[PDB]
Amino acid sequence: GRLRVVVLGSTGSIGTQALQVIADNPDRFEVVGLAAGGAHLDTLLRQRAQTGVTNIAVADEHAAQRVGDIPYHGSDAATRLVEQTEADVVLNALVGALGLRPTLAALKTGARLALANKESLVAGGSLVLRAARPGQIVPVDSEHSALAQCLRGGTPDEVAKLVLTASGGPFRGWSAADLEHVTPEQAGAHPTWSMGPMNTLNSASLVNKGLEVIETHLLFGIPYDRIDVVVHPQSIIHSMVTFIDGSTIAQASPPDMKLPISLALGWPRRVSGAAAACDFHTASSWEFEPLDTDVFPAVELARQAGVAGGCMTAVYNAANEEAAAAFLAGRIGFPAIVGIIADVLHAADQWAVEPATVDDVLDAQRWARERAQRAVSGM
Amino acid sequence: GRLRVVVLGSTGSIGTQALQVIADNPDRFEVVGLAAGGAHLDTLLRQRAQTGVTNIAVADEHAAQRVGDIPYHGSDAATRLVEQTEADVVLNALVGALGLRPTLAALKTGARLALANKESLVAGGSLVLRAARPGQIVPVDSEHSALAQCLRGGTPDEVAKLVLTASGGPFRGWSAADLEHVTPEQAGSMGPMNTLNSASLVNKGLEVIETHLLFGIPYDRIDVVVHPQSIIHSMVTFIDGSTIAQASPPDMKLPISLALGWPRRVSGAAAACDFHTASSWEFEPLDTDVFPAVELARQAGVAGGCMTAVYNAANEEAAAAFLAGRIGFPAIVGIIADVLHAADQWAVEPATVDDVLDAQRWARERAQRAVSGM
Ligand SMILES: CC(=O)N(O)CC[C@@H](c1ccc(Cl)c(Cl)c1)P(=O)(O)O
Numbered sequence: 001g002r003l004r005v006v007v008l009g010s011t012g013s014i015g016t017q018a019l020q021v022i023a024d025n026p027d028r029f030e031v032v033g034l035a036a037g038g039a040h041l042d043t044l045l046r047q048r049a050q051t052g053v054t055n056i057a058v059a060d061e062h063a064a065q066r067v068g069d070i071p072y073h074g075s076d077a078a079t080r081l082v083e084q085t086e087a088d089v090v091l092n093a094l095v096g097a098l099g100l101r102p103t104l105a106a107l108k109t110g111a112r113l114a115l116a117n118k119e120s121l122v123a124g125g126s127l128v129l130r131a132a133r134p135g136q137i138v139p140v141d142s143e144h145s146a147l148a149q150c151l152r153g154g155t156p157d158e159v160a161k162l163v164l165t166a167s168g169g170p171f172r173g174w175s176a177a178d179l180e181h182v183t184p185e186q187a188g189a190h191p192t193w194s195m196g197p198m199n200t201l202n203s204a205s206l207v208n209k210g211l212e213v214i215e216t217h218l219l220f221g222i223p224y225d226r227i228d229v230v231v232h233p234q235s236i237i238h239s240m241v242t243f244i245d246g247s248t249i250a251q252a253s254p255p256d257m258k259l260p261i262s263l264a265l266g267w268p269r270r271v272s273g274a275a276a277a278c279d280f281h282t283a284s285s286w287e288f289e290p291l292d293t294d295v296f297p298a299v300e301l302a303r304q305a306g307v308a309g310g311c312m313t314a315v316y317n318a319a320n321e322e323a324a325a326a327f328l329a330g331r332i333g334f335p336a337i338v339g340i341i342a343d344v345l346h347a348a349d350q351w352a353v354e355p356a357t358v359d360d361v362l363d364a365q366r367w368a369r370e371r372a373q374r375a376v377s378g379m
Numbered sequence: 380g381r382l383r384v385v386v387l388g389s390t391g392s393i394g395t396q397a398l399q400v401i402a403d404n405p406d407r408f409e410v411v412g413l414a415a416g417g418a419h420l421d422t423l424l425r426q427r428a429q430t431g432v433t434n435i436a437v438a439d440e441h442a443a444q445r446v447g448d449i450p451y452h453g454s455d456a457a458t459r460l461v462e463q464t465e466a467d468v469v470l471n472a473l474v475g476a477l478g479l480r481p482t483l484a485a486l487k488t489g490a491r492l493a494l495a496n497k498e499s500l501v502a503g504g505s506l507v508l509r510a511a512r513p514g515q516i517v518p519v520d521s522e523h524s525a526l527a528q529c530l531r532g533g534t535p536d537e538v539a540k541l542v543l544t545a546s547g548g549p550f551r552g553w554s555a556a557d558l559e560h561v562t563p564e565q566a567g568s569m570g571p572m573n574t575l576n577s578a579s580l581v582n583k584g585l586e587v588i589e590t591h592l593l594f595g596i597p598y599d600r601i602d603v604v605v606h607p608q609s610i611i612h613s614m615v616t617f618i619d620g621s622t623i624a625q626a627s628p629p630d631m632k633l634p635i636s637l638a639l640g641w642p643r644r645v646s647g648a649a650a651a652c653d654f655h656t657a658s659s660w661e662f663e664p665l666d667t668d669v670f671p672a673v674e675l676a677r678q679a680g681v682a683g684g685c686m687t688a689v690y691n692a693a694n695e696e697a698a699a700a701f702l703a704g705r706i707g708f709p710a711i712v713g714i715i716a717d718v719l720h721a722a723d724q725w726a727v728e729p730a731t732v733d734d735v736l737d738a739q740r741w742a743r744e745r746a747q748r749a750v751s752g753m
């Protein structure tokens with residue numbers, strides 16, 4: 001039958017791609033809610049006109065006053081929309097901190113949560129896990145989507161290892177000496193139109209992969225010592241699972257986010273024609289190589305944060321956001337990003353306590369941000 | 380919860396590796412029967428001593444005599460062992476045509492048939508399928524084991540394509556002119572027939588037919604890709620564009636162990652891919668001009684009935700002539716084609732084992748006729 005879908009973050013890359021999948025598949029999906037920030041208010045208003053969906057939310061009060069007929073407006077607009085809208089699936093594609101409360105509200109309604117928002121798991125951790133019931137959260141990103149599919153290859157008890165693939169970034173194979181010279185431009189600083197400026201840099205620094213490893217632990221309940229990373233420059237294999245008998249099951253497709261988005265929306269049922277398949281009529285190779293963890297320690301650091309638990313992964317991520325922004329601003333060199341994360345993390349053991357509230361998560365993030373600022377400035 | 384296993388073809392490669400899997404896993408598996416041809420009495424005698432199993436079948440009467448006191452001996456010994464031994468799993472690793480009757484006997488007992496003898500399914504066709512319940516036949520072949528695992532990635536209605544990987548053999552990339560000069564040594568662990576069939580691409584053709592029969596997927600949705608490393612063992616493409624693939628360093632103990640204990644995986648059966656060191660998995664299209672054995676397999680399979688029995692039997696005779704030094708390498712697949720072209724009457728579905736045997740008898744004769752013309 002038809003799934004009723006709420007799209008939170010409807011004007012970003014994931015949300016707009018999801019709306020395309022939904023427009024292509026009216027027999028499978030109907031939009032019953034849209035939420036956005038207000039920075040792209042014009043897009044949201046066009047979406048209302050196009051879909052006919054009037055059940056919309058705008059977070060920015062200032063933006064909302066340009067309109068006069070938006071039912072949900074102001075800081076917790078998305079949350080209130082989620083609380084009051086009958087839906088089968090909530091796609092949470094909101095950015096950063098504003099994803100957390102709508103995640104918690106989505107879980108409470110009993111809807112399936114198709115989760116793109118990284119902060120919900122990386123920062124919210126045990127708050128989100130204690131709120132979700134088994135199978136409720138379906139991951140939207142390609143690696144986690146790949147893992148969910150490969151885990152079908154056996155029972156939970158038959159799993160030996162999860163292996164996430166990583167592109168390796170623009171500096172794959174670079175030495176420590178090479179990294180010293182890295183400029184914001186080289187590391188992917190471009191005013192690109194849809195994605196965020198952090199995404200390309202987090203890829204380059206291996207911090208993105210670190211974040212994906214944390215999310216993997218929380219999504220699938222696999223110990224950190226059983227979550228490996230391999231560099232795979234083609235990004236065709238999106239991740240793999242090794243079972244206790246020696247068998248490895250991998251998911252492969254040409255890079256296209258409509259695949260994992262369509263599957264998250266329809267889970268557990270695949271959406272016919274979502275993406276193009278691998279074509280073996282032409283010759284290709286799929287290459288694998290180890291990550292040099294001496295040059296790129298961001299994943300080791302993520303495992304350290306994850307094992308410590310509580311709010312430590314919130315600290316990891318907040319330290320990154322601050323350090324990464326300082327590098328793009330010319331305040332630090334490239335290797336200093338992960339260097340500052342390590343230094344902030346090693347001072348952060350007070351945050352190993354489990355959060356009781358969203359406010360507790362916010363407090364850890366505040367401390368981490370300030371601590372990282374002090375590291376950058378020399379204070 | 381111990382599974383009682385009968386091992387047919389125990390002295391060959393698959394047979395010996397299965398005994399190793401069973402020996403490493405006494406809590407899951409127990410050998411209750413052994414069958415062999417009698418050409419490797421040293422191995423069989425060691426197997427009796429090591430397993431303690433005296434419930435043994437030896438095909439060759441003279442060889443069984445040289446051992447003495449064998450409970451089952453002569454051409455139908457393996458079949459009789461199957462009929463009379465209580466078991467949960469029959470591993471049929473017999474080679475070529477002698478596998479058919481034991482396969483049919485095994486299915487009739489209700490036991491799981493862990494099938495390494497693909498000939499019995501390729502030749503048996505619908506006769507074998509009608510004898511089996513759903514899931515009774517569990518493939519030992521690495522490609523089919525991989526497909527079975529990958530099919531867990533969705534529901535039957537979500538399957539778009541099955542993709543069989545092929546090593547390419549030692550003559551990958553070679554021209555038709557190059558193949559004229561191939562010697563039996565150049566086309567030489569699995570067995571002289573299996574090694575040759577890998578080189579000629581007839582093994583892949585046989586595996587294409589096996590796939591259709593095992594999984595019920597149309598021939599025009601079974602694809603072959605050349606993958607030199609043989610680490611990816613096969614893949615399934617689903618309707619959304621996702622492909623699920625199975626990968627491991629080549630080691631038959633993995634698919635053997637899974638076949639014996641299906642659906643349950645056997646801890647430590649084989650080594651996993653090591654992603655702490657670099658590797659590359661290469662893919663290339665098959666050269667269907669130089670190697671048309673796979674397309675001929677599809678043509679035989681589509682024709683159906685006893686036509687797949689013809690394909691296999693014609694191969695067995697031409698292959699034997701090549702190994703004897705009587706014909707050249709490219710003539711093997713040439714003869715299969717000529718024989719299939721003449722095989723009009725064999726599109727009829729086998730009602731009994733006798734129909735299959737009639738088809739094979741004719742195919743062997745027609746193959747010899749083709750050899751004589753060279
Ligand atoms: C081992 C197996 O399944 N075979 O049938 C042997 C033949 C196949 C083969 C050849 C070599 C290797 Cl290493 C493997 Cl795993 C498989 P081919 O792709 O050449 O037909």
Ligand SMILES: [Mn+2]
Pocket residue numbers: 141142143212
């Ligand atoms: Mn990703």
Ligand SMILES: [Mn+2]
Pocket residue numbers: 520521522586
């Ligand atoms: Mn095979």
